[PDB]
C-alpha cells in the first residue's frame, strides 16, 4: 500500500525557496528555483541574492536553503517522515553553532503551494566575529557532504536530527558547524515516525558563467540509509 504524501513525489517537482536573513545586522534576501526528483534523491537549484552581495559565504547557507526529496529505499519507506507530512507540510527549525564564532537560528515552513514545493525561511545570525571565517569570507566555495542523523521525537509527533559540517578554510584548516534540528508537522493528520537512520547527503556547488548577480548553482543527492535488508 502506497502512502498519501509519497504519491506527490513520484515525478519531477518544481521547487521555490525564499530566505530572509539578518546576520549581525546585515540584512539580505535569497531566492531559489529548481527541481527535485525523489526517485533518484536528486535536486538541482539556482539561488540568487536579491539584495546585492551576500554578506556571508554561500556554503554556510546550503543546509538551510528540502529533505522531502530524499530517496528512501523500498524497505525503509515506512520511515519517511518528510513525505508523510505533505502536502500540509512541516516546520523545520535549526540552531547552527559555528565553532569559535557565531550561530544561526533558522525557522522554515516547507509545504506545497499547488504543484510547487515551497521552502520559506527566516534566518537570524548573532555573535559573529567581524574578522572571523564567516564575516571575513575565508571559506572555500567547496562541496559539503555528510550524514544527517535522524531520530523520532514522539513527544512532538516529529523528528530531531544532528550533524556536523566541516567547511574547508582557504588556509587548509576546517570550520566546524554543529547542526541541531527539529521538524514538526503543520497539519493534524498522521505522520510516520521513524526508527533511527541517516540521510547521506552530498552537495556540489558551482557558478553560472553568464550570471552577474551573486548566486550559487547546486546539484545535490540525498539518500536514506542505515536500516538493514
mmCIF file of N, CA, C and O in Angstrom, residues 28-130:
data_model
loop_
_atom_site.group_PDB
_atom_site.id
_atom_site.type_symbol
_atom_site.label_atom_id
_atom_site.label_comp_id
_atom_site.label_asym_id
_atom_site.label_seq_id
_atom_site.Cartn_x
_atom_site.Cartn_y
_atom_site.Cartn_z
ATOM 1 N N UNK A 28 19.662 40.575 4.349
ATOM 2 C CA UNK A 28 19.764 40.102 2.988
ATOM 3 C C UNK A 28 18.618 39.148 2.674
ATOM 4 O O UNK A 28 17.968 38.644 3.570
ATOM 5 N N UNK A 29 18.348 38.955 1.391
ATOM 6 C CA UNK A 29 17.342 38.023 0.914
ATOM 7 C C UNK A 29 17.916 37.169 -0.192
ATOM 8 O O UNK A 29 18.712 37.634 -1.021
ATOM 9 N N UNK A 30 17.509 35.897 -0.175
ATOM 10 C CA UNK A 30 17.851 34.956 -1.231
ATOM 11 C C UNK A 30 16.595 34.308 -1.800
ATOM 12 O O UNK A 30 15.688 33.934 -1.053
ATOM 13 N N UNK A 31 16.574 34.122 -3.124
ATOM 14 C CA UNK A 31 15.504 33.409 -3.784
ATOM 15 C C UNK A 31 16.118 32.253 -4.562
ATOM 16 O O UNK A 31 17.207 32.369 -5.091
ATOM 17 N N UNK A 32 15.433 31.126 -4.607
ATOM 18 C CA UNK A 32 15.940 29.994 -5.379
ATOM 19 C C UNK A 32 14.855 29.261 -6.141
ATOM 20 O O UNK A 32 13.716 29.224 -5.709
ATOM 21 N N UNK A 33 15.219 28.677 -7.274
ATOM 22 C CA UNK A 33 14.318 27.878 -8.093
ATOM 23 C C UNK A 33 15.023 26.668 -8.591
ATOM 24 O O UNK A 33 16.218 26.705 -8.895
ATOM 25 N N UNK A 34 14.294 25.577 -8.710
ATOM 26 C CA UNK A 34 14.821 24.401 -9.354
ATOM 27 C C UNK A 34 13.830 23.286 -9.350
ATOM 28 O O UNK A 34 12.649 23.526 -9.380
ATOM 29 N N UNK A 35 14.320 22.057 -9.277
ATOM 30 C CA UNK A 35 13.502 20.859 -9.440
ATOM 31 C C UNK A 35 14.066 19.741 -8.576
ATOM 32 O O UNK A 35 15.292 19.677 -8.375
ATOM 33 N N UNK A 36 13.197 18.864 -8.082
ATOM 34 C CA UNK A 36 13.614 17.740 -7.297
ATOM 35 C C UNK A 36 12.973 16.464 -7.801
ATOM 36 O O UNK A 36 11.832 16.465 -8.266
ATOM 37 N N UNK A 37 13.715 15.372 -7.669
ATOM 38 C CA UNK A 37 13.297 14.085 -8.184
ATOM 39 C C UNK A 37 13.622 13.036 -7.150
ATOM 40 O O UNK A 37 14.729 12.520 -7.059
ATOM 41 N N UNK A 38 12.642 12.740 -6.327
ATOM 42 C CA UNK A 38 12.857 11.935 -5.158
ATOM 43 C C UNK A 38 13.112 10.463 -5.504
ATOM 44 O O UNK A 38 13.659 9.720 -4.699
ATOM 45 N N UNK A 39 12.702 10.060 -6.700
ATOM 46 C CA UNK A 39 13.025 8.708 -7.165
ATOM 47 C C UNK A 39 14.524 8.459 -7.153
ATOM 48 O O UNK A 39 14.970 7.363 -6.773
ATOM 49 N N UNK A 40 15.304 9.478 -7.532
ATOM 50 C CA UNK A 40 16.759 9.426 -7.534
ATOM 51 C C UNK A 40 17.457 10.190 -6.385
ATOM 52 O O UNK A 40 18.664 10.143 -6.254
ATOM 53 N N UNK A 41 16.680 10.842 -5.542
ATOM 54 C CA UNK A 41 17.224 11.692 -4.484
ATOM 55 C C UNK A 41 17.980 12.868 -5.019
ATOM 56 O O UNK A 41 18.945 13.310 -4.412
ATOM 57 N N UNK A 42 17.530 13.418 -6.149
ATOM 58 C CA UNK A 42 18.299 14.413 -6.877
ATOM 59 C C UNK A 42 17.624 15.789 -6.883
ATOM 60 O O UNK A 42 16.426 15.887 -7.128
ATOM 61 N N UNK A 43 18.420 16.807 -6.539
ATOM 62 C CA UNK A 43 17.993 18.209 -6.557
ATOM 63 C C UNK A 43 18.909 19.063 -7.412
ATOM 64 O O UNK A 43 20.116 18.956 -7.288
ATOM 65 N N UNK A 44 18.321 19.942 -8.232
ATOM 66 C CA UNK A 44 19.085 20.915 -8.978
ATOM 67 C C UNK A 44 18.458 22.262 -8.726
ATOM 68 O O UNK A 44 17.247 22.416 -8.949
ATOM 69 N N UNK A 45 19.249 23.193 -8.186
ATOM 70 C CA UNK A 45 18.756 24.506 -7.819
ATOM 71 C C UNK A 45 19.724 25.629 -8.180
ATOM 72 O O UNK A 45 20.935 25.460 -8.185
ATOM 73 N N UNK A 46 19.176 26.813 -8.424
ATOM 74 C CA UNK A 46 19.985 28.013 -8.512
ATOM 75 C C UNK A 46 19.415 29.052 -7.581
ATOM 76 O O UNK A 46 18.200 29.312 -7.588
ATOM 77 N N UNK A 47 20.298 29.657 -6.803
ATOM 78 C CA UNK A 47 19.961 30.646 -5.822
ATOM 79 C C UNK A 47 20.612 31.962 -6.198
ATOM 80 O O UNK A 47 21.741 31.991 -6.648
ATOM 81 N N UNK A 48 19.877 33.031 -5.941
ATOM 82 C CA UNK A 48 20.329 34.378 -6.228
ATOM 83 C C UNK A 48 20.141 35.250 -4.992
ATOM 84 O O UNK A 48 19.117 35.207 -4.303
ATOM 85 N N UNK A 49 21.150 36.051 -4.681
ATOM 86 C CA UNK A 49 20.995 37.050 -3.616
ATOM 87 C C UNK A 49 20.315 38.283 -4.236
ATOM 88 O O UNK A 49 20.895 38.965 -5.081
ATOM 89 N N UNK A 50 19.088 38.547 -3.826
ATOM 90 C CA UNK A 50 18.244 39.570 -4.466
ATOM 91 C C UNK A 50 18.527 40.968 -3.935
ATOM 92 O O UNK A 50 18.095 41.931 -4.524
ATOM 93 N N UNK A 51 19.262 41.089 -2.840
ATOM 94 C CA UNK A 51 19.554 42.382 -2.234
ATOM 95 C C UNK A 51 20.948 42.912 -2.536
ATOM 96 O O UNK A 51 21.345 43.948 -2.003
ATOM 97 N N UNK A 52 21.684 42.231 -3.401
ATOM 98 C CA UNK A 52 23.064 42.613 -3.721
ATOM 99 C C UNK A 52 24.075 41.535 -3.381
ATOM 100 O O UNK A 52 23.958 40.390 -3.815
ATOM 101 N N UNK A 53 25.090 41.896 -2.619
ATOM 102 C CA UNK A 53 26.178 40.974 -2.305
ATOM 103 C C UNK A 53 25.771 40.208 -1.050
ATOM 104 O O UNK A 53 25.291 40.806 -0.089
ATOM 105 N N UNK A 54 25.962 38.895 -1.051
ATOM 106 C CA UNK A 54 25.651 38.133 0.134
ATOM 107 C C UNK A 54 26.693 38.432 1.203
ATOM 108 O O UNK A 54 27.886 38.349 0.913
ATOM 109 N N UNK A 55 26.274 38.761 2.446
ATOM 110 C CA UNK A 55 27.248 39.126 3.489
ATOM 111 C C UNK A 55 27.922 37.980 4.235
ATOM 112 O O UNK A 55 28.782 38.237 5.052
ATOM 113 N N UNK A 56 27.532 36.739 3.961
ATOM 114 C CA UNK A 56 28.182 35.559 4.481
ATOM 115 C C UNK A 56 28.506 34.630 3.301
ATOM 116 O O UNK A 56 27.970 34.807 2.224
ATOM 117 N N UNK A 57 29.386 33.659 3.489
ATOM 118 C CA UNK A 57 29.718 32.756 2.417
ATOM 119 C C UNK A 57 28.551 31.870 2.022
ATOM 120 O O UNK A 57 27.890 31.287 2.875
ATOM 121 N N UNK A 58 28.352 31.687 0.737
ATOM 122 C CA UNK A 58 27.320 30.759 0.282
ATOM 123 C C UNK A 58 27.318 29.374 0.915
ATOM 124 O O UNK A 58 26.267 28.826 1.160
ATOM 125 N N UNK A 59 28.497 28.736 1.092
ATOM 126 C CA UNK A 59 28.479 27.379 1.663
ATOM 127 C C UNK A 59 27.827 27.290 3.007
ATOM 128 O O UNK A 59 27.309 26.238 3.340
ATOM 129 N N UNK A 60 27.834 28.393 3.742
ATOM 130 C CA UNK A 60 27.215 28.414 5.064
ATOM 131 C C UNK A 60 25.691 28.348 5.043
ATOM 132 O O UNK A 60 25.094 28.110 6.100
ATOM 133 N N UNK A 61 25.096 28.611 3.897
ATOM 134 C CA UNK A 61 23.638 28.669 3.756
ATOM 135 C C UNK A 61 23.077 27.398 3.108
ATOM 136 O O UNK A 61 21.885 27.231 3.069
ATOM 137 N N UNK A 62 23.938 26.508 2.613
ATOM 138 C CA UNK A 62 23.444 25.340 1.877
ATOM 139 C C UNK A 62 22.461 24.523 2.698
ATOM 140 O O UNK A 62 21.391 24.167 2.229
ATOM 141 N N UNK A 63 22.841 24.196 3.934
ATOM 142 C CA UNK A 63 21.961 23.307 4.704
ATOM 143 C C UNK A 63 20.613 23.930 5.018
ATOM 144 O O UNK A 63 19.604 23.213 5.174
ATOM 145 N N UNK A 64 20.584 25.255 5.140
ATOM 146 C CA UNK A 64 19.359 25.955 5.410
ATOM 147 C C UNK A 64 18.463 26.021 4.176
ATOM 148 O O UNK A 64 17.259 25.784 4.235
ATOM 149 N N UNK A 65 19.059 26.350 3.031
ATOM 150 C CA UNK A 65 18.307 26.500 1.802
ATOM 151 C C UNK A 65 17.776 25.163 1.304
ATOM 152 O O UNK A 65 16.647 25.083 0.755
ATOM 153 N N UNK A 66 15.260 20.813 2.005
ATOM 154 C CA UNK A 66 14.035 20.183 1.430
ATOM 155 C C UNK A 66 14.256 18.681 1.381
ATOM 156 O O UNK A 66 14.320 18.034 0.308
ATOM 157 N N UNK A 67 14.360 18.136 2.587
ATOM 158 C CA UNK A 67 14.738 16.737 2.819
ATOM 159 C C UNK A 67 13.633 15.767 2.419
ATOM 160 O O UNK A 67 13.850 14.553 2.408
ATOM 161 N N UNK A 68 12.456 16.290 2.082
ATOM 162 C CA UNK A 68 11.403 15.510 1.466
ATOM 163 C C UNK A 68 11.788 14.939 0.104
ATOM 164 O O UNK A 68 11.077 14.082 -0.407
ATOM 165 N N UNK A 69 12.874 15.416 -0.507
ATOM 166 C CA UNK A 69 13.314 14.854 -1.787
ATOM 167 C C UNK A 69 14.299 13.691 -1.624
ATOM 168 O O UNK A 69 14.849 13.241 -2.610
ATOM 169 N N UNK A 70 14.516 13.216 -0.397
ATOM 170 C CA UNK A 70 15.421 12.091 -0.153
ATOM 171 C C UNK A 70 14.887 10.861 -0.846
ATOM 172 O O UNK A 70 13.666 10.644 -0.848
ATOM 173 N N UNK A 71 15.792 10.100 -1.459
ATOM 174 C CA UNK A 71 15.442 8.740 -1.904
ATOM 175 C C UNK A 71 15.428 7.823 -0.705
ATOM 176 O O UNK A 71 16.466 7.581 -0.075
ATOM 177 N N UNK A 72 14.244 7.337 -0.343
ATOM 178 C CA UNK A 72 14.139 6.266 0.664
ATOM 179 C C UNK A 72 14.068 4.909 -0.059
ATOM 180 O O UNK A 72 13.217 4.726 -0.919
ATOM 181 N N UNK A 73 15.001 4.018 0.252
ATOM 182 C CA UNK A 73 14.895 2.662 -0.324
ATOM 183 C C UNK A 73 13.538 2.034 -0.010
ATOM 184 O O UNK A 73 12.938 2.346 1.000
ATOM 185 N N UNK A 74 13.059 1.127 -0.872
ATOM 186 C CA UNK A 74 11.772 0.461 -0.630
ATOM 187 C C UNK A 74 11.570 -0.100 0.773
ATOM 188 O O UNK A 74 10.477 0.063 1.353
ATOM 189 N N UNK A 75 12.589 -0.754 1.320
ATOM 190 C CA UNK A 75 12.465 -1.344 2.638
ATOM 191 C C UNK A 75 12.456 -0.365 3.796
ATOM 192 O O UNK A 75 12.246 -0.769 4.934
ATOM 193 N N UNK A 76 12.709 0.914 3.515
ATOM 194 C CA UNK A 76 12.684 1.962 4.535
ATOM 195 C C UNK A 76 11.553 2.969 4.339
ATOM 196 O O UNK A 76 11.510 3.968 5.050
ATOM 197 N N UNK A 77 10.643 2.728 3.393
ATOM 198 C CA UNK A 77 9.604 3.716 3.107
ATOM 199 C C UNK A 77 8.734 4.057 4.337
ATOM 200 O O UNK A 77 8.239 5.184 4.437
ATOM 201 N N UNK A 78 8.608 3.157 5.300
ATOM 202 C CA UNK A 78 7.764 3.478 6.451
ATOM 203 C C UNK A 78 8.436 4.446 7.419
ATOM 204 O O UNK A 78 7.822 4.851 8.397
ATOM 205 N N UNK A 79 9.682 4.840 7.111
ATOM 206 C CA UNK A 79 10.450 5.738 7.966
ATOM 207 C C UNK A 79 10.592 7.161 7.408
ATOM 208 O O UNK A 79 11.263 7.992 8.018
ATOM 209 N N UNK A 80 9.877 7.451 6.324
ATOM 210 C CA UNK A 80 9.988 8.757 5.650
ATOM 211 C C UNK A 80 8.968 9.758 6.239
ATOM 212 O O UNK A 80 7.860 9.943 5.737
ATOM 213 N N UNK A 81 9.389 10.432 7.301
ATOM 214 C CA UNK A 81 8.570 11.422 7.965
ATOM 215 C C UNK A 81 8.249 12.569 7.010
ATOM 216 O O UNK A 81 7.140 13.098 6.958
ATOM 217 N N UNK A 82 9.269 12.978 6.236
ATOM 218 C CA UNK A 82 9.166 14.211 5.499
ATOM 219 C C UNK A 82 8.045 14.177 4.451
ATOM 220 O O UNK A 82 7.275 15.135 4.339
ATOM 221 N N UNK A 83 7.945 13.091 3.663
ATOM 222 C CA UNK A 83 6.859 12.976 2.692
ATOM 223 C C UNK A 83 5.524 12.741 3.364
ATOM 224 O O UNK A 83 4.495 13.186 2.826
ATOM 225 N N UNK A 84 5.518 12.059 4.504
ATOM 226 C CA UNK A 84 4.223 11.744 5.166
ATOM 227 C C UNK A 84 3.518 12.997 5.645
ATOM 228 O O UNK A 84 2.292 13.035 5.832
ATOM 229 N N UNK A 85 4.293 14.053 5.873
ATOM 230 C CA UNK A 85 3.730 15.323 6.324
ATOM 231 C C UNK A 85 3.085 16.169 5.229
ATOM 232 O O UNK A 85 2.473 17.203 5.524
ATOM 233 N N UNK A 86 3.251 15.778 3.975
ATOM 234 C CA UNK A 86 2.779 16.522 2.821
ATOM 235 C C UNK A 86 1.335 16.145 2.462
ATOM 236 O O UNK A 86 0.920 15.043 2.727
ATOM 237 N N UNK A 87 0.578 17.043 1.858
ATOM 238 C CA UNK A 87 1.035 18.362 1.349
ATOM 239 C C UNK A 87 1.001 19.513 2.341
ATOM 240 O O UNK A 87 1.506 20.599 2.008
ATOM 241 N N UNK A 88 0.430 19.303 3.529
ATOM 242 C CA UNK A 88 0.242 20.353 4.548
ATOM 243 C C UNK A 88 1.587 20.897 5.017
ATOM 244 O O UNK A 88 1.747 22.102 5.271
ATOM 245 N N UNK A 89 2.548 19.997 5.133
ATOM 246 C CA UNK A 89 3.965 20.402 5.308
ATOM 247 C C UNK A 89 4.485 20.227 6.718
ATOM 248 O O UNK A 89 3.818 19.656 7.605
ATOM 249 N N UNK A 90 5.676 20.771 6.958
ATOM 250 C CA UNK A 90 6.277 20.717 8.262
ATOM 251 C C UNK A 90 7.087 22.001 8.506
ATOM 252 O O UNK A 90 7.428 22.713 7.563
ATOM 253 N N UNK A 91 7.328 22.273 9.776
ATOM 254 C CA UNK A 91 8.206 23.339 10.200
ATOM 255 C C UNK A 91 9.550 22.685 10.448
ATOM 256 O O UNK A 91 9.634 21.635 11.096
ATOM 257 N N UNK A 92 10.612 23.299 9.934
ATOM 258 C CA UNK A 92 11.981 22.881 10.187
ATOM 259 C C UNK A 92 12.758 23.986 10.904
ATOM 260 O O UNK A 92 12.846 25.121 10.379
ATOM 261 N N UNK A 93 13.206 23.692 12.123
ATOM 262 C CA UNK A 93 13.985 24.669 12.917
ATOM 263 C C UNK A 93 15.365 24.138 13.154
ATOM 264 O O UNK A 93 15.531 22.957 13.346
ATOM 265 N N UNK A 94 16.375 25.022 13.111
ATOM 266 C CA UNK A 94 17.727 24.659 13.467
ATOM 267 C C UNK A 94 18.388 25.721 14.306
ATOM 268 O O UNK A 94 18.019 26.890 14.216
ATOM 269 N N UNK A 95 19.378 25.284 15.065
ATOM 270 C CA UNK A 95 20.433 26.136 15.555
ATOM 271 C C UNK A 95 21.709 25.559 15.014
ATOM 272 O O UNK A 95 21.924 24.348 15.050
ATOM 273 N N UNK A 96 22.553 26.418 14.463
ATOM 274 C CA UNK A 96 23.782 26.013 13.832
ATOM 275 C C UNK A 96 24.893 26.776 14.559
ATOM 276 O O UNK A 96 24.954 28.010 14.475
ATOM 277 N N UNK A 97 25.745 26.041 15.241
ATOM 278 C CA UNK A 97 26.811 26.649 16.008
ATOM 279 C C UNK A 97 28.093 26.560 15.222
ATOM 280 O O UNK A 97 28.616 25.475 14.952
ATOM 281 N N UNK A 98 28.662 27.727 14.882
ATOM 282 C CA UNK A 98 29.971 27.769 14.206
ATOM 283 C C UNK A 98 31.040 27.825 15.285
ATOM 284 O O UNK A 98 31.052 28.745 16.094
ATOM 285 N N UNK A 99 31.892 26.810 15.313
ATOM 286 C CA UNK A 99 32.905 26.707 16.394
ATOM 287 C C UNK A 99 33.763 27.958 16.447
ATOM 288 O O UNK A 99 34.254 28.427 15.412
ATOM 289 N N UNK A 100 33.901 28.516 17.644
ATOM 290 C CA UNK A 100 34.690 29.743 17.875
ATOM 291 C C UNK A 100 34.148 30.975 17.164
ATOM 292 O O UNK A 100 34.894 31.905 16.886
ATOM 293 N N UNK A 101 32.851 30.977 16.841
ATOM 294 C CA UNK A 101 32.260 32.081 16.108
ATOM 295 C C UNK A 101 30.779 32.116 16.470
ATOM 296 O O UNK A 101 30.412 31.615 17.531
ATOM 297 N N UNK A 102 29.941 32.725 15.631
ATOM 298 C CA UNK A 102 28.532 32.931 15.985
ATOM 299 C C UNK A 102 27.622 31.747 15.676
ATOM 300 O O UNK A 102 28.093 30.645 15.433
ATOM 301 N N UNK A 103 26.329 32.005 15.720
ATOM 302 C CA UNK A 103 25.336 30.959 15.471
ATOM 303 C C UNK A 103 24.246 31.475 14.558
ATOM 304 O O UNK A 103 23.911 32.658 14.571
ATOM 305 N N UNK A 104 23.710 30.566 13.740
ATOM 306 C CA UNK A 104 22.470 30.821 13.035
ATOM 307 C C UNK A 104 21.320 30.144 13.735
ATOM 308 O O UNK A 104 21.462 29.026 14.200
ATOM 309 N N UNK A 105 20.188 30.832 13.783
ATOM 310 C CA UNK A 105 18.914 30.200 14.135
ATOM 311 C C UNK A 105 17.976 30.365 12.965
ATOM 312 O O UNK A 105 17.784 31.477 12.432
ATOM 313 N N UNK A 106 17.373 29.250 12.553
ATOM 314 C CA UNK A 106 16.548 29.238 11.390
ATOM 315 C C UNK A 106 15.190 28.626 11.685
ATOM 316 O O UNK A 106 15.064 27.738 12.519
ATOM 317 N N UNK A 107 14.188 29.143 11.021
ATOM 318 C CA UNK A 107 12.845 28.568 11.035
ATOM 319 C C UNK A 107 12.295 28.616 9.628
ATOM 320 O O UNK A 107 12.271 29.683 8.996
ATOM 321 N N UNK A 108 11.837 27.473 9.116
ATOM 322 C CA UNK A 108 11.305 27.371 7.784
ATOM 323 C C UNK A 108 10.018 26.613 7.806
ATOM 324 O O UNK A 108 9.827 25.730 8.653
ATOM 325 N N UNK A 109 9.161 26.944 6.873
ATOM 326 C CA UNK A 109 7.972 26.162 6.556
ATOM 327 C C UNK A 109 8.134 25.556 5.168
ATOM 328 O O UNK A 109 8.459 26.262 4.198
ATOM 329 N N UNK A 110 7.954 24.240 5.083
ATOM 330 C CA UNK A 110 8.094 23.505 3.868
ATOM 331 C C UNK A 110 6.751 22.873 3.533
ATOM 332 O O UNK A 110 6.261 22.068 4.301
ATOM 333 N N UNK A 111 6.167 23.268 2.435
ATOM 334 C CA UNK A 111 4.829 22.809 2.048
ATOM 335 C C UNK A 111 4.588 22.966 0.597
ATOM 336 O O UNK A 111 5.326 23.660 -0.101
ATOM 337 N N UNK A 112 3.512 22.355 0.105
ATOM 338 C CA UNK A 112 3.106 22.600 -1.292
ATOM 339 C C UNK A 112 2.205 23.830 -1.436
ATOM 340 O O UNK A 112 1.354 24.059 -0.586
ATOM 341 N N UNK A 113 2.503 24.633 -2.447
ATOM 342 C CA UNK A 113 1.584 25.690 -2.976
ATOM 343 C C UNK A 113 1.250 25.260 -4.389
ATOM 344 O O UNK A 113 2.014 25.485 -5.356
ATOM 345 N N UNK A 114 0.093 24.610 -4.523
ATOM 346 C CA UNK A 114 -0.292 23.991 -5.786
ATOM 347 C C UNK A 114 0.671 22.850 -6.058
ATOM 348 O O UNK A 114 0.848 22.016 -5.196
ATOM 349 N N UNK A 115 1.284 22.879 -7.233
ATOM 350 C CA UNK A 115 2.156 21.819 -7.712
ATOM 351 C C UNK A 115 3.589 22.100 -7.265
ATOM 352 O O UNK A 115 4.469 21.294 -7.558
ATOM 353 N N UNK A 116 3.832 23.241 -6.609
ATOM 354 C CA UNK A 116 5.201 23.673 -6.311
ATOM 355 C C UNK A 116 5.525 23.426 -4.855
ATOM 356 O O UNK A 116 4.758 23.714 -3.980
ATOM 357 N N UNK A 117 6.708 22.877 -4.612
ATOM 358 C CA UNK A 117 7.179 22.687 -3.258
ATOM 359 C C UNK A 117 7.930 23.928 -2.819
ATOM 360 O O UNK A 117 8.915 24.318 -3.467
ATOM 361 N N UNK A 118 7.438 24.551 -1.738
ATOM 362 C CA UNK A 118 7.988 25.818 -1.290
ATOM 363 C C UNK A 118 8.714 25.664 0.028
ATOM 364 O O UNK A 118 8.211 25.062 0.968
ATOM 365 N N UNK A 119 9.902 26.285 0.119
ATOM 366 C CA UNK A 119 10.647 26.379 1.365
ATOM 367 C C UNK A 119 10.835 27.859 1.751
ATOM 368 O O UNK A 119 11.577 28.567 1.095
ATOM 369 N N UNK A 120 10.119 28.317 2.773
ATOM 370 C CA UNK A 120 10.159 29.728 3.200
ATOM 371 C C UNK A 120 10.882 29.791 4.518
ATOM 372 O O UNK A 120 10.457 29.196 5.492
ATOM 373 N N UNK A 121 11.961 30.556 4.554
ATOM 374 C CA UNK A 121 12.905 30.556 5.650
ATOM 375 C C UNK A 121 13.181 31.921 6.248
ATOM 376 O O UNK A 121 13.272 32.910 5.515
ATOM 377 N N UNK A 122 13.260 31.973 7.575
ATOM 378 C CA UNK A 122 13.830 33.134 8.259
ATOM 379 C C UNK A 122 15.093 32.727 8.960
ATOM 380 O O UNK A 122 15.106 31.730 9.689
ATOM 381 N N UNK A 123 16.162 33.516 8.811
ATOM 382 C CA UNK A 123 17.419 33.211 9.425
ATOM 383 C C UNK A 123 17.912 34.410 10.233
ATOM 384 O O UNK A 123 17.879 35.544 9.755
ATOM 385 N N UNK A 124 18.357 34.136 11.438
ATOM 386 C CA UNK A 124 18.957 35.130 12.325
ATOM 387 C C UNK A 124 20.318 34.652 12.792
ATOM 388 O O UNK A 124 20.455 33.523 13.313
ATOM 389 N N UNK A 125 21.340 35.472 12.574
ATOM 390 C CA UNK A 125 22.706 35.152 12.960
ATOM 391 C C UNK A 125 23.220 36.209 13.919
ATOM 392 O O UNK A 125 23.002 37.418 13.672
ATOM 393 N N UNK A 126 23.767 35.730 15.025
ATOM 394 C CA UNK A 126 24.324 36.623 16.042
ATOM 395 C C UNK A 126 25.679 36.183 16.538
ATOM 396 O O UNK A 126 26.066 35.033 16.410
ATOM 397 N N UNK A 127 26.411 37.152 17.110
ATOM 398 C CA UNK A 127 27.683 36.894 17.810
ATOM 399 C C UNK A 127 28.804 36.430 16.916
ATOM 400 O O UNK A 127 29.743 35.771 17.360
ATOM 401 N N UNK A 128 28.737 36.810 15.651
ATOM 402 C CA UNK A 128 29.812 36.555 14.732
ATOM 403 C C UNK A 128 30.929 37.573 14.867
ATOM 404 O O UNK A 128 30.677 38.722 15.149
ATOM 405 N N UNK A 129 32.143 37.085 14.642
ATOM 406 C CA UNK A 129 33.342 37.909 14.699
ATOM 407 C C UNK A 129 33.570 38.577 13.342
ATOM 408 O O UNK A 129 33.575 37.926 12.301
ATOM 409 N N UNK A 130 33.758 39.895 13.343
ATOM 410 C CA UNK A 130 33.957 40.626 12.075
ATOM 411 C C UNK A 130 35.167 40.144 11.254
ATOM 412 O O UNK A 130 35.162 40.231 10.035
#
